[PDB]
Amino acid sequence: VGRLIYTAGGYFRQSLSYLEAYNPSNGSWLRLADLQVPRSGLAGCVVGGLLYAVGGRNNSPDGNTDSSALDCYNPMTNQWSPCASMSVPRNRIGVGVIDGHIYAVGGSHGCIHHSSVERYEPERDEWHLVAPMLTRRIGVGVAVLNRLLYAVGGFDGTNRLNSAECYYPERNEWRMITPMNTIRSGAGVCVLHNCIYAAGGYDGQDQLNSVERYDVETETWTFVAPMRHHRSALGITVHQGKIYVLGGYDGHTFLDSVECYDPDSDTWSEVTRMTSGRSGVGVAVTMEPC
Ligand SMILES: O=C(O)/C=C/c1ccc(O)c(O)c1
Ligand SMILES: [Ca+2]
């Protein structure tokens, strides 16, 4: 569905269990049922009115467990319940939905930077591996447009990436696309109109406020207006033809700042701030609870 912006887990001193929902209609937040396990560098998505939290890591004071977890949140009940886990733990995961099916992309397992990719069947509650990406990517940005899944940037273990690639499901194939103008890991990646947006991230030197978009038709990346705050490991989603960026690290602060991009006016504005500063959250949109 679509009515609230849910932000699940994230990081500040350690991984966090928070689920809170923003209402752009009235500027209001709700605190909702905590994740059963705290998680940073996870991804959110939504299928048939249920919110999913996928992978990440528990950076606790008593150890650092990378997650293979798929946890399901029903806003009708305000409860989390476990779903089938993935083949492997994926911290700094990218996630995308094609026709009711969830794709989990790359991310890290301790030292290991994954190229692997796997697909969840909600009704059957089963995961199956698909074709690996051409490139190992963690902190990868992942978005779906026209039933094609795009994997943008991240970190291959040695180099941060400007590269990007496209999964064609009918062929179970990955092809390279035009690289970005800017090297980005931990970028906020989403879809709006006929473009894949890569917002912020890290180029190896500094946190970025630049936003560029890929036209799937023309195959070019153009910069748009930048965000006010430089950010990496930011949350990103789309509601009512607008990009929302939540949180991130600017090099000095875990930002509580929420920016909104208007593609009509090519401008960003501050629309609220989160109850607390935090990085590496999952974000997605569904019906309001209860
Ligand atoms: O207007 C903005 O928001 C973007 C521009 C910008 C902001 C900060 C910098 O350090 C910089 O080189 C460029
Ligand atoms: Ca490796």
Side-chain angles (χ1 to χ4, degrees), residues 95-99 103 142-150 191 196:
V95 149
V97 171
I98 313 185
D99 168 62
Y103 289 71
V142 171
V144 171
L145 165 78
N146 190 29
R147 292 179 54 179
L148 302 173
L149 187 135
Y150 293 86
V191 168
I196 314 305

Side-chain angles (χ1 to χ4, degrees), residues 209 226-228 230:
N209 72 340
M227 305 177 301
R228 293 194 183 169
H230 290 238

